[PDB]
Structure 1
Amino acid sequence: MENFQKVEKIGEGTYGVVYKARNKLTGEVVALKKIRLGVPSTAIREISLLKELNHPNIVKLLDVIHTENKLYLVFEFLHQDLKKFMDASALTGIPLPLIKSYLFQLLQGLAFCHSHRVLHRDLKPQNLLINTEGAIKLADFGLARAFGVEVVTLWYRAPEILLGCKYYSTAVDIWSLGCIFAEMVTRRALFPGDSEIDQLFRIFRTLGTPDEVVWPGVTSMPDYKPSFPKWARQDFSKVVPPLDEDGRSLLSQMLHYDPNKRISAKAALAHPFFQDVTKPVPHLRL
């Protein structure tokens, strides 16, 4: 902490406060995360694996500073988060070519992470960071599993997590990114639940209550109740106007109930929606 001069608080998360800060020696501007708490050995080792998980669409973890039994993560600083950008673009909407670019890049980032068996587990607009050059990057990648631990947003949570599955798969991240894709397009959160059951029931109201036909094994999950109401599925035509039919096909594959049926990041990259992908420049007010 002594090595940095705090500039301003930029986030408050489950695992600690994040500051924009400047390195006192070099003048580098960084994001400094003070991890909330000595540090268990296992957390140290998992975080140290994250230091080598480098990709253009993953926020670079510059240093892990484990001293005086405190843990600080030093990240490269990005200039804005997707939440703030979405809120800024709410009059006209993020142009589709930019949406498509951001989706494609995030899919590249996930394919890379997934290929190393690392999951995010908590994708949401506040953890997607953008720059002036057109890039978008996944932040706080791998921290949920490293640490294992003011209101938690449930809006992006996959249904298998809500239904009590103990072992997460890479599919949880595809589900979350699907939710975010929809939200960019419509300018409203797809499933804005305010409790676990409200989140589950908002999913069920839109995609239909899952059963053994669409999700074999669903009825044996830990928090599945035979008493859940049975709602009929809606058409994606009603869920995300004015997404074009390729966008809609791809979304539907990202939002399959059965995580085993849900598209992988790798497969998503070859989807016809990306045949005309480009990399536009956003208009950022900093």
Structure 2
Amino acid sequence: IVKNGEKWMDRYEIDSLIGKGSFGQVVKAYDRVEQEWVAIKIIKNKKAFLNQAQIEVRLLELMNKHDTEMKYYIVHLKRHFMFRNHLCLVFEMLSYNLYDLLRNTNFRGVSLNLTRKFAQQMCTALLFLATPELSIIHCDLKPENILLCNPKRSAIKIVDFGSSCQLGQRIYQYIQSRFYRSPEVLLGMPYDLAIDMWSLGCILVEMHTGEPLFSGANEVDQMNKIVEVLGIPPAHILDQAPKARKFFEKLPDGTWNLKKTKDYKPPGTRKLHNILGVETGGPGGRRAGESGHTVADYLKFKDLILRMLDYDPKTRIQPYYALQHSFFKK
């Protein structure tokens, strides 16, 4: 839609394409007023994308009118305007995303120490979104949506509030990227901020192993891969779940089991202990003997992840309590 060298509103000079989304495109541009480069998110000229992007603008502006040390893990929306019938969101420039970081490791993962730094910033971000007057559910956390602030540094920010909603302003039943989709969403249940913490747990294991924890090809495969690691979800959750019978079957004695199709490891036998290599030199043993990768370091990480992957969104660890975990103690 946009040429390089093109000038908008005697303010912005378009340089190049940064990225394309379902929403439209992101371009690098020079702002002559501030005298800085910015990223402009250009929404498609169609009602569906316009209306959802108007929600993104509202939630970013809501976040910006809160000045607390907790808010600086969200990309900064500088302003927005309408141009040629496209809503245009102007952000600060950021660097490459955590998927690019994994790709750059040949999908062998970053160190437990770099994983910890990401975890601590993401947990702080989620604590900010949980502030009562915000209560923002990101709904699409994944490596692609976490960007480095600076290619020399390990500071990150979350981008893409395109799926996001406040608690009690849910639109879609089917949300989150499948690999990072919470059990409560797979099961058709009303969701709250705890779905982001599920995504985060998935993301942190992936950042350290190089590979997605739960790479379902569809929702049935997704839930089966979750069950391999974490077992059958508890009956009290399945009993209240609209879509339990998409994946599970209830038995005479009021118990639940997998529906099986034609031929997964038996429920709960694919141990996070072994995925992480807690006692076997880390993922594929590639961290054997490296500092900051002892059994004790690993056990703390495993414990925090298993708390983030609680099936029960009620007892799943919350951002403040995640920040107090031993994994983050020097």
Q: What TM-score, normalized by structure 1, do the two folds share?
A: 0.84
- Determine which of 136, 142, 158 is the counterpart of 1:138: 158
Residue in structure 1 matching 2:41, options 21, 33, 54:
33
Structure 1 residues 48 and 58: CA distance shift in structure 2, 3 A = closer
Q: Is 1:162 aligned to 2:162, yes or no? A: no
Asked if structure 1 preserves the Cα contact closer than 8 Å seen for 2:140 and 2:177, the reply is: no
Q: In structure 1, how many angstroms separate the alpha carbons of the residues matched to 2:124 and 2:130?
A: 10
Q: Cα deviation per residue 1:23-65 (whole Å; 9 max; x = unaligned)?
A: 2554421111112336449736445324435622111111122
Deviation at 1:274, TM superposition (A): 0.3
| Residue among 252, 255, 259 paired with 2:309 | 255
TM-fit CA distance, 1:69: 4.5
Alpha-carbon shift at residue 181 of structure 1 (Å)? 0.5
1:189 to 199, 212, 223: 212
Q: 1:12 to 1:94 in 2, by over 3 A?
A: same
The equivalences for 1:26-105 within 5 A come to 26-36=34-44, 37=46, 39-40=50-51, 43=55, 45-46=58-59, 48-52=61-65, 55-66=71-82, 69-90=85-106, 93-105=109-121
Pair 1:121-2:139 in alignment: yes
Q: Identity over the aligned pairs, expressed in percent?
A: 33
Distance 2:24 2:268 in 1: 39
Is the 2:141–2:199 contact (alpha carbons within 8 Å) kept by the matching residues of 1?
Answer: yes
Structure-2 change in CA distance of 1:195 and 1:92 (3 Å): closer
Tell me the amino acid that sits aligned with residue 201 of structure 2. Answer: G
The CA deviation at 1:202 is: 1.5
Residue correspondences, number: 270
Q: Which has the larger radius of gyration?
A: 2
Deviations 1:82-133 (A, max 9, x none): 1111111237631221111111011111101112311111101010011233
1:206 aligned residue (229, 233, 256): 229
Counterparts of 1:11 and 1:200, CA distance in 2 = 31
Q: Which letter does structure 1 place at the counterpart of 2:27?
A: Y
* Structure-2 change in CA distance of 1:189 and 1:8 (3 Å): same
Amino acid at match of 2:92: E
Q: Give SS of 2:27's match.
A: strand
Q: CA deviation at 1:240?
A: 1.9
Taking the aligned partners of 1:45 and 1:97, their CA distance within structure 2 comes to 35
Q: Provide the rounded CA distance (Å) in 2 between the counterparts of 1:219 and 1:6.
A: 54
Show the counterpart of 2:325: 271
> For residues 197 and 9 of structure 1, do their structure 2 counterparts lie closer, same or farther at Cα, with a shift above 3 Å needed?
farther
Give the conservation status (yes or no) of the 8 Å contact 2:140–2:163: no
Note the residue ranges of structure 1 that are not aligned, 5 or more in a row: 277-286
Q: Match for 2:24 among 16, 37, 42?
A: 16
**2:244 is paired with a residue of what secondary structure?**
coil
SS at match of 1:111: helix
The gaps in structure 2 that reach 5 residues or longer are: 1-6, 250-257, 261-265, 283-296
| C-alpha spacing 1:180/1:52, structure 2 compared with 1 (3 Å) | same
Q: Could you tell me how far apart the structure 2 residues matched to 1:11 and 1:99 are?
A: 25
Is contact 2:40–2:91 with CA below 8 Å preserved after alignment? yes
Cα separation, 2, equivalents of 1:16 and 1:67 = 14
SS at match of 2:153: coil
| Aligned-pair Cα RMSD in Å | 2.6
Q: Which runs of 4+ in 1 moved over 6 A?
A: none
1:65 match: secondary structure: strand
- The secondary structure found in structure 2 opposite 1:191 is coil
Letter in 2 for 1:157: R
Asked whether the equivalents of residues 50 and 61 of structure 1 are also in contact (C-alpha less than 8 Å), the reply is no
